């Protein structure tokens, strides 16, 4: 839960690459998620009709929702762990309305790492992957604790 200053630097350095194309990264990540863990698609009434990766690729709505997710995640990561204010609304909606278990947040964490690895091999080597894994794990653990604080079992 305590990353080194160097680890946060590696996280924010590759995050800057994501920010050059937020929608493309977001669509790639959601498509990877739905492909790797298809049960997650069923949480989205707006996407559950999409039956193939190619259909997902053509979905402009999926690109927009990719921006929605990554915009929130980027703001969290930039806080370098001090993200209490940012997790409050996300925990509220994801625990009590969307009903997303923490395990699904683990699935999307794996998708994020997969997409970063594929799109940024030169800036996402072993050290950067380790750092991003720690940053996403911190996010998951803190949001799991916030679910519990709100009265819910993630
Ligand atoms: C990095 C992890 C995630 C982030 C930052 C994130 C962020 C967001 C944001 C900002 C919204 C819109 C505002 C809100 O309702 O809170 C949203 C909506 C939503 N999220 Fe997430 N989300 C994440 C992971 C997930 C996962 C893994 C699932 C399901 C597998 C999910 C399911 C949903 C659903 C169903 C909605 C509403 C969709 C709709 O209205 O059509 N989220 N998310």
DSSP codes, 83-149 = -HHHHHHHHHHHHHTS---HHHHHHHHHHHHHHHHHH-GGG-SHHHHHHHHHHHHHHHHHHHHHHHH
- Name the fold adopted by 1-154: Globin-like (1.10.490)
Experimental method used, please? X-ray
Question: Alpha-carbon distance 124 to 113, whole Å?
Answer: 9
Give me the resolution in angstroms, 1 decimal.
1.7
Q: What residues line ligand 1, using a CB cutoff of 6 Å?
A: 40, 43-44, 46, 68-69, 72-73, 90, 93-94, 98, 100, 104-105, 108
Q: What number does the ligand 1 atom closest to the CA of 109 have?
A: 1
Q: Which of 73, 77, 90, 91 to mutate to test the pocket of ligand 1 (most atoms within 8 A of CB)?
A: 90
Q: Is 145 exposed, middle or buried (0-12, 13-18, 19+ CB in 10 A)?
A: middle
């Amino acid at each position: 839960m305590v990353l080194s200053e160097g680890e946060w630097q590696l996280v924010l350095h590759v995050w800057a690459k994501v920010e050059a194309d937020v929608a493309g990264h977001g669509q790639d990540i959601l498509i990877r998620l739905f492909k790797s863990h298809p049960e997650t698609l069923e949480k989205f009434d707006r996407f559950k009709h999409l039956k193939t990766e190619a259909e997902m690729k053509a979905s402009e709505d999926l690109k927009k929702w990719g921006v929605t997710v990554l915009t929130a995640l980027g703001a969290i990561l930039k806080k370098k762990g001090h993200h209490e204010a940012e997790l409050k609304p996300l925990a509220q909606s994801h625990a009590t309305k969307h009903k997303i278990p923490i395990k699904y947040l683990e699935f999307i964490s794996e998708a994020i790492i997969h997409v970063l690895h594929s799109r940024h091999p030169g800036n996402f080597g072993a050290d950067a992957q380790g750092a991003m894994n720690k940053a996403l794990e911190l996010f998951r653990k803190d949001i799991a604790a916030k679910y519990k604080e709100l009265g819910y079992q993630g």
